[PDB]
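Narrative progress, year one. The postdoctoral researcher (J.K.) led the effort to move from monomer predictions toward full complexes, under supervision of the PI. The following entry was the first complex the group processed end to end, covering 608 residues in total.
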Amino acid sequence: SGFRKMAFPSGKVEGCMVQVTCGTTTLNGLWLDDVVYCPRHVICTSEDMLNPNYEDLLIRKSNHNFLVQAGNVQLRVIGHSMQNCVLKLKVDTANPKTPKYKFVRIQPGQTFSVLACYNGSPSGVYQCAMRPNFTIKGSFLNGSCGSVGFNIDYDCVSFCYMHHMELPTGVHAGTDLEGNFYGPFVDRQTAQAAGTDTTITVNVLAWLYAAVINGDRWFLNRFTTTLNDFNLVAMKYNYEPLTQDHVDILGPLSAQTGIAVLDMCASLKELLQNGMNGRTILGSALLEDEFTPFDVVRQCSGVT
Amino acid sequence: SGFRKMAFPSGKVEGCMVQVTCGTTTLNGLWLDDVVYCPRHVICTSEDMLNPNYEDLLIRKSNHNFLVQAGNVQLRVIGHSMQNCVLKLKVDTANPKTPKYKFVRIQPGQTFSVLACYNGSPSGVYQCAMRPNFTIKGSFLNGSCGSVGFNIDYDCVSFCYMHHMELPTGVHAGTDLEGNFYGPFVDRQTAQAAGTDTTITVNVLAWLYAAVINGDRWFLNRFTTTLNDFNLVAMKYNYEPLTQDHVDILGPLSAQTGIAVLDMCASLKELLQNGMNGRTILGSALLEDEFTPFDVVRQCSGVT
Ligand SMILES: Cc1ccncc1NC(=O)CC1CC2(CC2)C1
Ligand SMILES: Cc1ccncc1NC(=O)CC1CC2(CC2)C1
């Protein structure tokens, strides 16, 4: 009973968090095996920020300029390299707390947990969705750069995001663990357009199924729709078009509840057209799109 | 930038989670030092559930009937005692991962993080508020009993909640770590009334301050109110009466934003009376009461 915006347990990720300082800037690094991953903007200074020449800035840096501290102990840096927008600092000690891990590039609409950190120390954990426009609506302050996003399949941690930047609009931008930015963003202090965002339709439908599973069913109606009719409504309301692939991923929830995917789409159509009429669904007065169908199945079945 | 329902990092609590089996029932236990804490209903069977005689049920149990497993290794139980609604199983090994900890009994309206577990394994973490009526609106399934709620001050974990039960209404009830239920609840399979719940006024005000700090200010008006006028509105809308103690706790947020507490109360008064008019505050279409003024200060300043 109950449905919460649940994050993965952050323990395996806390054991990887380190502090990285270069010059006067301190941020977070991720220590996996004998490598420390961090945003390359750690090598910048305030004059360099509007358009840094990272190649030139890194050339003036030697292994001993990168101060990496894992809690109270200092790590010895024996190599440094820039891969896209990340720095990889080779250290002489493999992290004893390295969990089984993978680097993955998530798709827009997928969810993940963020372990927000400052000075290499964890402050909190929350569940995020990578927006269709490749931004995240996180909670990050100066010093949070290098905080990571991840998913956990039993004992394996799939790292998918590293935080780099806060856009002038207050939304966040970052990279995969190979330093490739999600979206069109560049690591510069420049105004950058995030694309038009949309609501993650498949996730809203998954959350409507979660609502039915947990007793909230007032929104179920006597109607049905087609993918084409629904997609006309989705276009008008800035929702992602629903495809047969999305319908297929909703199969387990459709089977559990006995509510056909197109019947659920018709409920969503009526909610989009008429609103909630002052009512709530799973304690929310808006349509929630931060739960994937996989998240709903996992939470609704207690996968550990 | 940004404001999220952030939970504490669960690492220190994951290292304490164990599985406890007695007879055919398996649930979660909390291993701190050489003691394993778990709900006493682990000793029950389906016939006993409508009104268990815990004293009699425990008498038929010996140390060897309590199977405690910490991951893959089995713990040796050398003592057992019932303290209120919890069982304390003395084990021969002190938990090497025991963090600095305290047992605390939280007040209604206070928040905490829950590490949901099944079979001694963590599945997820979320931030909760203890409702004014002493229930929690969690996400728990069969097997989650023994999952705990906590807060973290730097390196010290204050355990405040242990999950015991799901009421017929889908809301949750549990105890402090001395086995005292929060609320009038008893550990029996009986329909139990939770009191009339109210909205945590001080927390909504704290969240309105967080909204202003993060750029959402459309709700700020040209009005002010008094504690008495505001409390008349709070009574009508099932909000907790605001006291000078609540106003005092809002002092830091009032000082940061320069918005007097009574001016913020007037904004809340207008939102209660007129609604949101289809608008949102920090991505919510309802008034959020799960952030204390302490949570807002912590998140808004990046305390680790
Ligand atoms: C201030 C803040 C808040 C939240 N997250 C991140 C930040 N930090 C930044 O965005 C500054 C970085 C971006 C850069 C040009 C390469 C320097
Ligand atoms: C089924 C479930 C779901 C979520 N949380 C908890 C549960 N479990 C229970 O409430 C069963 C317990 C309560 C008892 C009388 C003493 C047996």
